Amino acid sequence: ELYTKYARVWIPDPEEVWKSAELLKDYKPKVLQLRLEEGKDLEYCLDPKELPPLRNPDILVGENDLTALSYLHEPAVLHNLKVRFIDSKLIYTYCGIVLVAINPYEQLPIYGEDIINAYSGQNMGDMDPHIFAVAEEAYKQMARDERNQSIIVSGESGAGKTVSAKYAMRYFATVSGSANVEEKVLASNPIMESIGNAKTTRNDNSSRFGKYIEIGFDKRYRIIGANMRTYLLEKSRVVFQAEEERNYHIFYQLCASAALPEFKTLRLGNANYFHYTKQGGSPVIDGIDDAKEMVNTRQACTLLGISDSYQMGIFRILAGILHLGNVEFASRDSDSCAIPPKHDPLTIFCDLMGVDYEEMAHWLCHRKLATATETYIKPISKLHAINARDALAKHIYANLFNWIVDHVNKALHSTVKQHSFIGVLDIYGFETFEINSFEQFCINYANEKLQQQFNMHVFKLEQEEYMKEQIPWTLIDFYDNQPCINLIEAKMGVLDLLDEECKMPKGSDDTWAQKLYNTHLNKCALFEKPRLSNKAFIIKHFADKVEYQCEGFLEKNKDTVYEEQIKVLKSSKKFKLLPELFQDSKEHKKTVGHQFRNSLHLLMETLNATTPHYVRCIKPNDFKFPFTFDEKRAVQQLRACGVLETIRISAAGFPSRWTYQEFFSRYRVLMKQKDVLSDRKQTCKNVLEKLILDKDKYQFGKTKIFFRAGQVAYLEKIRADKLRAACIRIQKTIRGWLMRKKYMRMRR
Amino acid sequence: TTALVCDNGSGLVKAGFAGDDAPRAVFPSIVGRPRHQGVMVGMGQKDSYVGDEAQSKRGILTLKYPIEHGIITNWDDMEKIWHHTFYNELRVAPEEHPTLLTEAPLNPKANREKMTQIMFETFNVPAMYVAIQAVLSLYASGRTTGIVLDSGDGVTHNVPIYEGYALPHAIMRLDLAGRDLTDYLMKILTERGYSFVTTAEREIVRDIKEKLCYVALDFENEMATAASSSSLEKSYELPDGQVITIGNERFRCPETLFQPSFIGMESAGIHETTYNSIMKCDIDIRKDLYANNVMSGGTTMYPGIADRMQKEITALAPSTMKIKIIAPPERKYSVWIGGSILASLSTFQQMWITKQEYDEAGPSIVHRKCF
Amino acid sequence: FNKDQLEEFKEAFELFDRVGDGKILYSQCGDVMRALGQNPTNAEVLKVLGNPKSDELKSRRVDFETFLPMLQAVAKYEDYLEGFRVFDGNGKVMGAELRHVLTTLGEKMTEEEVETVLAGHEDSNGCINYEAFLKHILS
Ligand SMILES: C/C1=C\[C@H](C)C[C@H](C)OC(=O)C[C@H](c2ccc(O)cc2)NC(=O)[C@@H](Cc2c(Br)[nH]c3ccccc23)N(C)C(=O)[C@H](C)NC(=O)[C@@H](C)C1
Ligand SMILES: Nc1ncnc2c1ncn2[C@@H]1O[C@H](COP(=O)(O)OP(=O)(O)O)[C@@H](O)[C@H]1O
Ligand SMILES: [Mg+2]
């Protein structure tokens, strides 16, 4: 077998996720005699059955493409990235069609202008990987064919998705021949950060939405302009946070400026005074001045041509949402409530918005039914009043966000008709915490859909390459996460039962969980129950299993916005913006899970129109050190980006391809002169058919040999054996001949 | 596809799409035929009228009600009323949409058999179900425990429910009604000299009963009050513009619900059948039934019926045990609202009767699946 | 080995005796075997020596009589040609590649040994006729 003395293996180690070892005696069927670098010697158990991951030869290590490696497993990937990053400082790397970008915190020269002119024209493999190589592969495919192109970027927001997008746009501008997309797009970033980013337990300044920039090209492929869209915004954060989280930065940037005179009308308090900001208990981010960020947000708005009249509108509405949060109900009787007399938060909310106090106080505590002929004003429980108030806050914020994006687009658009576009998606990756909740559940469902699109695109490209090389395409094996997506989204899926439990009377998180267990517990292999609890469930995702706690779900999922409360706000006359938000039914009834599932189907329609290109970003250390690579953090990030699962899917197929001359050169050391022949293709067919016994392992394409995983490492080892033995024989002959001459000299 | 939700009764038909907040089509459920020789030529004489048309024309017509006491008692007129409901008044073809149908409990089985047979054969509805009115009132009022009292035109029935289980032995049914209150109102109104004989006059009496009756909080005290004083006495305008004045009688009319002995039945009133239904339930649940009494259907709309019920049950029930009456203002429609909620649920989509199951089993399937 | 062979070998052995006690070191056993016409690998030499430890390999001394069975045991071209054709197919070998493999793979030799055997054998391109070099080192 492949395990021999003088072979190298990876052993699992808790301090650094894998450690290298050498095998001291050849294996024969329950212990291995293992050398190390950490001391010479160690004794290592085999386990009931297992062999360690076997280590690739050092010709393949440090290749520009992880799927050049003959063994594909977590140790090889982690090592190969570490040696490229630490030794050569090559941050970019490839895996299949994906570009992995490892973020140095240090700045680099490599983005500099000349290289733009160097990459342009070059086919994707002909140059070492760099973000420009993907930017060209899009620009070239757009010019070559009708289709728009998309670039898709994933990872924890620290990982540097924005820097990758920024450089992609510089590539487009500089090759295309430009005006003022780049300066404007980078000018928008502080606004979209302030209103769309959030602070999460694992990460400060997380971005809770997917943001899409459509760069527009003329029929001459000159950059016209750009268009922005936003998807998947999580509304629930506005009303509710877990411990040690904040809702969107803008509320804290607004409260931090409460002293300033233009804000004084808002009567803003200390950031933990209000009900929406205080719940996380975490007002100050370490190492940020919020008041300074407010000034940067305003100046970015001014630079995008939102006049100061509207900026004071925006902050007026946000202070409105904060004051609305403090409104507090007393129950009269178990199915009725009212607001107490002259309640100070409601009075300030009515002053800030203009709506007359009696009408808000009336509508917050009642709802209106109407048949066409008759109308009933009906009281509602204190709980329903709270759910309606929070639904009104979420509805205001979601429309304010959509409005600010419509104005940014008004600055970014330009009049010339867009001939085709290239669209660069910054999204979040797969996400798991000690505690997982409706937010994580929606993020993971979005990532399952994106991962499905990626798997189908890779499978299409590989089918086309197999048909190109005259191989049977029926060999290639397709791996389909549709069974999980059907678990989450199909009828009597998790989301559909959550929506049912919202409306069913006396609904609760316990009765929801019980409906899950009845519906799925042993019917679907992907759904599992944690043994020691009844308030949680486990979904086997693409990447990993994830426990989700039930305790949040129904409280967060509910929206219903009572139509009269909007009609009251819409009637207000004091200022332009508040009527302007709500301008254009069934949608008011929809739950947050259903609005999310619709937004994700729009995103998938937008991407399906387009040919993708992928970037992954990984954050190499937890503490922003300039080049330290922490193999624990990088392993976690590589799992969360699905790179390891991509490599698993690839390793099943034929990952490794050789051109007949390049093969023939390397293995001419093995080949015998009788086998050498006037047709190298036939020569290699003969030699290979002898060297590796089972023809199932390899295929002959028209111009390329394909090999299953490991076979190239096997050939490299037999090559090293033959060359070693030949070297030993010549060395012993030369050593003998010289010492024998010294013997003859003593004889003479 | 949104299921239809249709709620038949004596009196109004209520229909609309599932997931709507309130019913889209509401109209009194009448089939009318002309009873005079048509003299004019080119009049456009029409074989029969349905719903609002029969109300407008009514002076020319005999009005018949095809449902008495929750039983469909001539199937041709009922099939006309469904035809009018789907085609004229909702304007949606039934071959597209599941349908949900509503019935009073403890009805004859043939009423469910025929109602399903007509839905599958004559409208080709792809799937149908039949719910109990009282169960649906609990979905509408937002509960899984309570004793529902639901009284419309036709049937009055109590159904106790406890955490989502019915208690079939405790179901009670009574035939006091908006309708028998109307016939009593005519028979007492005669005592002041006003005689409403024909069916189109009965519709006037029904409108007097809606506008002017109210349930006396204490009966003999208001009888003495009306004897002593005009102050209780109030007046109304018939369609031709004559005025009529009605006195103590206007509270006397809705009281027969509390004392059926007035119309001539012996079975006790809705308070005592509510109490007797609770008493037939086992002793551990009873606190929660007293905590929730849910009223439903139009005959519980009278001003003061909620307070008269709370007082009169409290007098019957043990003194410590808190009695509460839950009378939501919408309660005339709550059987439809409950049907809307139920038809919208995802779990229910399993539970429709489907056309294949009907073709396999024949129309008896309804008894097995529905209740 | 016969008496004549034993006499020639003993004389040679005594020429390699650098201490005068009529003995060699274990570490010299391989040297004597190669000086006597054997071409053992380092592994074979250590094996016939009994895989001695460093201390006795460097300081324990053995006379001819104990050495002899080991010499016997060790004692008991086309592969050489193909082995050289490994490093070629015009019958030449780069001097750099042969130097690298002889100094970095197998039982590594010193650069000076390789220079000594290679002196005068490379042409202006730095190419070695390996059939001639092989005959030379086998002579
Ligand atoms: C002579 C008798 C019965 C009948 C005349 C005998 C005939 C033979 O029975 C039928 O089959 C006819 C019919 C009927 C109608 C439709 C149908 O698909 C099947 C049967 N059912 C009726 O007329 C019911 C309707 C009804 C009232 Br209100 N509440 C009820 C509560 C529950 C159930 C049903 C009802 N009805 C008025 C009676 O029973 C009356 C009160 N019964 C009597 O006075 C006694 C002395 C027996
Ligand atoms: N405000 C009201 N007060 C008293 N009775 C009413 C009122 N509105 C309707 N009704 C009566 O209630 C009956 C209709 O009840 P309803 O439950 O709506 O019928 P259905 O049984 O078809 O649902 C009719 O007798 C009608 O006259
Ligand atoms: Mg009814």
Author numbering:
A (entry chain A): 5 to 33, 36 to 54, 57 to 186, 190 to 595, 629 to 792
B (entry chain C): 5 to 375
C (entry chain B): 4 to 79, 86 to 97, 100 to 150
Which of the paper's sentences describe this entry?
By using the actin cytoskeleton as tracks, myosin also powers cellular cargo transport processes and can serve as a molecular anchor and force sensor. The myosin motor domain consists of four subdomains: the actin-binding upper and lower 50 kDa (U50 and L50) domains, which are separated by the central actin-binding cleft, the N-terminal domain, and the converter domain, containing the long α-helical extension known as the lever arm. The active site of myosin is located at the interface of the U50 domain and the N-terminal domain and is allosterically coupled to both the actin-binding interface and the lever arm.
To investigate the structural effect the nucleotide state of F-actin has on myosin-V, we have also determined the structure of the rigor complex starting from young ADP-Pi-bound F-actin, rather than from aged ADP-bound F-actin. The atomic model of myosin in this structure superimposes perfectly with the one bound to aged F-actin-PHD, indicating that the nucleotide state of F-actin has no structural effect on myosin-V in the rigor state. Surprisingly, and despite having ADP-Pi bound to its active site, F-actin adopts the closed D-loop state, which is characteristic for aged ADP-bound F-actin. Thus, we conclude that binding of myosin-V to young F-actin-JASP induces structural changes that ultimately result in the closed D-loop conformation, thereby abolishing the effect of JASP. Conversely, it has a remarkable effect on the structure of young F-actin-JASP, specifically selecting the closed D-loop state and thereby overriding the ‘rejuvenating effect’ of JASP.
